[PDB]
Write a protein that binds this ligand. Structure first.
Ligand code: HEM
Ligand code: HEM
Ligand SMILES: CC(C)(C)OC(=O)N[C@H](CSC[C@H](Cc1ccccc1)C(=O)NCCCc1cccnc1)Cc1ccccc1
Ligand SMILES: CC(C)(C)OC(=O)N[C@H](CSC[C@H](Cc1ccccc1)C(=O)NCCCc1cccnc1)Cc1ccccc1
Lengths: 454, 454
């Protein structure tokens, strides 16, 4: 009933089958399909997620108009997502004057001042990591990064948000550790063909987040809420905040606590895994980086907030990895008005998509796009890089509110880990890595590596 | 479109509201509503579960026609239940010539011969129970029965079916113990008003059993299948069985393994909890029973299969409890034909229901129906009891296939428990017990009791 939309505006794309759209083209994952499309169709193309049209753009100025310029006016919300139940009040899912109300009420939690106030705490679990690694290093036993990294990222989230202190790797059976550790699978494809069936599940209290984990943290939060009240973390600042322009409700407060936890668990863990792979497969880079760390932190000195930003080959290494594996893959915004941006009409209701993964591997802005070369981000060459071709944290008012915290969380782990250990591939280590043909930005085979002690 | 069905046949009942039916009358639970209806309307009445008519019968001969006589011809299947995914092949859910095919292929597992072959095994975990109770008995700390009883019933199921041996109470964090321990809640009411929405969830692979626990046991079973093949329990006999009239498939085999596990976990545990309450609130009965046990098993002798059936005050105690709390509450069968049984027309499609709980408390067949008096089942008075008024295990071809195993499982626990401990109520012990106004036959407040050692 709408599969003729791009044929009308003269916008190219693959031919959508009825009802399915082009979702059968996802057999190789969003990334390979975007790379193919960006290659076949050029600067702008179109396709249909079921009955839903999606438009892809690759011009730095047009992306800037959508993410930055016309964010408030036109492109304010991401693609609708459901069923969710009470999770409607979550920021990344919120919309319009209820997003602007929440993005404000929670921005003060990622300031340089508060972020520096978390340096003594995040550092405490970088140490706990070393013991868990050294126990498996002295017992030569190849190591799965995501396991031990997940336990660390888990340990940092909990502390930085609620104060609950657990050695999740050695307490994988703690009642607070279990609950926590929990788009092309059989369900979500049925959602994109049956978006008319989402409202059924919403009057059903059925949620893609199980109704159990949430109810454990609706109460675990209100336990801690009444445990510090009255008697430095994310929640101590979210309680200080409810003390535009209505204050923060309490089921509203329980919702954002959850979104941070995923945000910083599988992403802090996944990215650190993509990094230790690149170091293990480019040991020269691992050499140059351990030299820089011990030059800023001699005698294995403890990283501080001001020493972390001081490490430049560290930032270069982090950036280049994110180019190769930008965990979001795509950036998306929903167009709320008949608007003509940068000389092109965008009708109301169209999802606007930026293919981040494909753009990070576009040879027109990247020489040797699939090799690992941190030298792209040296202060020498870091200036020929369009800020709208490279967006691992998005851009504009709706970008990643936790970016500063993520770059600080990961670099405090890399300093403390690379001060002590070094990483060599295994025989059973997948060289080279194959990306998941599925729906998340993750490896086909989990990253296994040999670990030795300095 | 069908709410005029009972008005037509001249059958009385509460007035159904559009779409909801009489389900708003479930605010006091199925039990209180059936008692009320049986009291207001007499021997036969009618009501609507949404758009679905249900007919209640209370005559011994008419129940016998449905459960026993015309089971094969007319009343073969229970009320349709979904969504379920692959669990369609489960016996209690199976229908017609695929139930008759499965009820046969699995009946040989509850014979007196095989049941006696499980006596040495089930006895091993009655002992493990004592230590866990004595640890909390020597530390005077009131005891929650369902916790420790659940761990025991759990320990017996696993062993009697797969051989996996765990102290689930002290291993509540065993990867095999966790998966296992998992009708008027917000969901199932939406199902009975929206039965047209079930087929949506079936093409969605959404199942009221989470798609996770099942996939752990589709593989855990096929681990054990290829671990004994090649190298006494339920599965060793289900593999021996696939060695009417097609053999047992392997996803067919994974399904029945699950249905036994619930069947014998929350029911073996719940019933033993309703029993220890009745003993604690009628200590004279507890006195008479410990005398009988030590008279059959002197010196705290180990129960055997032939000593267990020998205990008559034990059976009396078990029976009378089940009268007071018959965990099924109702028996149901779906009518597949225009039939006129015992002088009454039953049109096609009508669910036929027997109110077991209400009938167990009907003063016309029970003197002092709400008191606890095991003497109703003494060999003296046990003959004035209609086998179709008292059906804790159902009746006829479709009755509880595991009845013999349940009466043997529980009595082996009561002998070993009452040989050693005695049970007194607490202050915080709920005297008298309030039944759950909800959907399962369970207490409002979990049973807590003081435990002392002989
Ligand atoms: C390697 C680490 C991370 C990366 C690469 C990353 C990337 C992104 C990206 C690309 C977006 C979408 C931005 C857009 O649409 O323009 C986003 C959104 C978001 N991120 Fe992250 N993220 C990371 C870690 C975190 C962490 C640790 C948090 C902790 C709270 C967090 C919280 C959020 C939130 C709340 C949003 C939604 C913002 C909004 O809609 O206003 N992220 N992130
Ligand atoms: C206190 C213990 C138990 C009680 C009171 C009980 C009661 C019942 C009742 C009333 C029914 C329905 C019968 C009917 O519709 O006429 C039933 C069915 C069933 N029970 Fe139990 N049960 C118990 C324990 C068990 C156990 C331990 C198992 C182990 C496998 C089991 C397996 C089954 C099965 C498979 C069915 C369905 C039979 C069929 O549809 O063919 N039950 N039970
Ligand atoms: C794809 C379509 C168009 C159908 O729907 C969307 O696009 N929905 C996206 C994600 S759905 C739900 C998600 C939270 C969640 C998902 C699964 C298990 C547990 C929690 C969310 O609510 N928020 C995600 C925030 C966590 C995060 C991830 C990466 C970086 N930083 C933070 C929304 C999204 C937000 C941010 C980046 C990328 C996507
Ligand atoms: C009420 C309407 C009319 C809508 O649906 C039905 O009546 N569905 C009944 C039960 S639903 C699913 C159930 C299994 C199950 C349920 C919940 C969590 C885990 C597993 C089953 O599949 N089987 C139950 C067998 C276990 C058992 C319980 C008690 C005694 N022995 C064995 C089916 C039923 C079977 C047997 C007795 C009472 C009810």
């Amino acid at each position: 009933h709408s599969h003729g939309l791009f044929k009308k505006l003269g916008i190219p794309g693959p031919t959508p089958l009825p009802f399915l759209g082009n979702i059968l083209s996802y057999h190789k994952g969003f990334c390979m399909f975007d790379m193919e499309c960006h290659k076949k169709y050029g600067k702008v193309w179109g396709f249909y997620d079921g009955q839903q049209p999606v438009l892809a753009i690759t011009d730095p100025d047009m992306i800037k108009t959508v993410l930055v310029k016309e964010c408030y006016s036109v492109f304010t919300n991401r693609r609708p997502f459901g069923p969710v139940g009470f999770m409607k009040s979550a920021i990344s899912i919120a919309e319009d004057e209820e997003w602007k109300r929440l993005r404000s009420l929670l921005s003060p939690t990622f300031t340089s001042g508060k972020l520096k106030e978390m340096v003594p705490i995040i550092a405490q679990y970088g140490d706990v990591l070393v013991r868990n690694l050294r126990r498996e290093a002295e017992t030569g036993k190849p190591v799965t990064l995501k396991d031990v990294f997940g336990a660390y990222s888990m340990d940092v989230i909990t502390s930085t948000s609620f104060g609950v202190n657990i050695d999740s790797l050695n307490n994988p059976q703690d009642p607070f550790v279990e609950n926590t550790k929990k788009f092309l699978d059989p369900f979500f494809l049925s959602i994109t063909v049956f978006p008319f069936l989402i409202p059924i599940l919403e009057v059903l209290n059925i949620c893609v987040f199980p109704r159990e984990v949430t109810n454990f943290l609706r109460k675990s939060v209100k336990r801690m809420k009444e445990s510090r009240l009255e008697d430095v973390d994310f929640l101590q600042l979210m309680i200080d905040s409810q003390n535009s322009h209505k204050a923060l409700s309490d089921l509203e407060l329980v919702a954002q606590s959850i979104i941070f936890i995923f945000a910083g668990y599988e992403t802090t863990s996944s990215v650190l895994s993509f990094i230790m792979y690149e170091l293990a497969t480019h040991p020269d880079v691992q050499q140059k980086l351990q030299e820089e760390i011990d030059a800023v932190l001699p005698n294995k000195a403890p990283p501080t907030y001001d020493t972390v930003l001081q490490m430049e080959y560290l930032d270069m290494v982090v950036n280049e990895t994110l180019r190769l594996f930008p965990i979001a893959m795509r950036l998306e915004r929903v167009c709320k008005k008949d608007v003509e941006i940068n000389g092109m009409f965008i009708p109301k209701g169209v999802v606007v998509m930026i293919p981040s993964y494909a753009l990070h591997r576009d040879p027109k802005y990247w020489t040797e796009p699939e090799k690992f070369l941190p030298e792209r981000f040296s202060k020498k060459n870091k200036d020929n890089i369009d800020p709208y071709i490279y967006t691992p944290f998005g851009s504009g008012p709706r970008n990643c509110i936790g970016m500063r915290f993520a770059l600080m969380n990961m670099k405090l782990a890399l300093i403390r880990v690379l001060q002590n250990f070094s990483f060599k591939p295994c025989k059973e280590t997948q060289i080279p890595l194959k990306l998941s043909l599925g729906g998340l930005l993750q490896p086909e085979k989990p990253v296994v590596l040999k670990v030795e002690s300095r």
